Design a protein around this ligand. Structure first.
Ligand SMILES: [Mg+2]
Length: 238
């Protein structure tokens, strides 16, 4: 299951900080759809406070998500769906799109489609929460940088370079996965991310029928600083 290489890459990602933030905006016990959930690490933490449903385009990642849920006796439905065309049968009180998952969208249209889909799934008062890269992060940490590390089962080399569009990044990943015989299998992947100034996102949210409640930086209560790396949005369906 190749998907575990992602769990190792993020073993030190402080997911409980995202969960603590969701807890400030959505009352525990409510129903949440966590979209673009990957291997569901944050989704499973959310399941400890909310009735949660996870959605991602990757069957492989959702398989790991499910196995982890079953091994910890959590009930969490994971379904394969594209965030721009969400469709859930039961009502949800909030939608979460965490850890820059929204940034994998490639066009302005994709983002508007995602927001419209979110609005259709929520009723009056439902919340939409997401965090994204700031323009500053794109221009610094993803501006021709190299990242690499070793975990127990795999090692990776990650190059982060500007893409063709403004505020875009091309992540060139190479994983060396250890096999049963102690030798390594290489897997190369290319991921694309794109961001926008926060004001562009606020406009789209309003066009999609949301009231923007808060725009904050780096897990703090205040508006983003000019050197903020991650921007958090809280919006509510009108
Ligand atoms: Mg209202």
């Amino acid at each position: 299951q190749f998907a575990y290489v992602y769990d190792e890459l993020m073993q030190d990602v402080p997911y409980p900080e995202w969960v603590a933030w969701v807890l400030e905006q959505v009352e525990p016990g409510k129903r949440i759809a966590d979209i673009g959930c990957g291997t569901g690490t944050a989704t499973l933490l959310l399941a400890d406070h909310y009735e949660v449903t996870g959605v991602d385009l990757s069957e492989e990642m959702l398989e790991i998500a499910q196995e982890k849920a079953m091994e910890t006796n959590r009930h969490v439905d994971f379904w394969v769906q594209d965030m721009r065309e969400l469709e859930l049968p039961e009502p949800v009180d909030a939608i979460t799109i965490l850890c820059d998952s929204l940034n994998y969208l490639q066009t302005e249209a994709d983002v508007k489609q995602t927001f419209d889909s979110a609005a259709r799934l929520l009723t009056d008062g439902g919340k939409l929460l997401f965090d994204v890269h700031s323009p500053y992060k794109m221009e610094t940490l993803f501006n021709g940088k190299t990242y690499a590390t070793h975990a127990e089962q795999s090692s990776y080399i990650w190059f982060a370079d500007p893409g063709e569009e403004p505020l875009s990044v091309v992540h060139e990943l190479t994983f060396f996965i250890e096999g049963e015989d102690g030798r390594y299998d290489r897997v190369d992947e290319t991921h694309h991310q794109r961001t926008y100034p926060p004001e562009q996102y606020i406009t789209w949210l309003r066009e999609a029928g949301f009231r923007v409640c808060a725009v904050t930086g780096d897990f703090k209560s205040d508006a983003p600083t000019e050197t903020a790396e991650r921007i958090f949005f809280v919006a509510e369906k009108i």
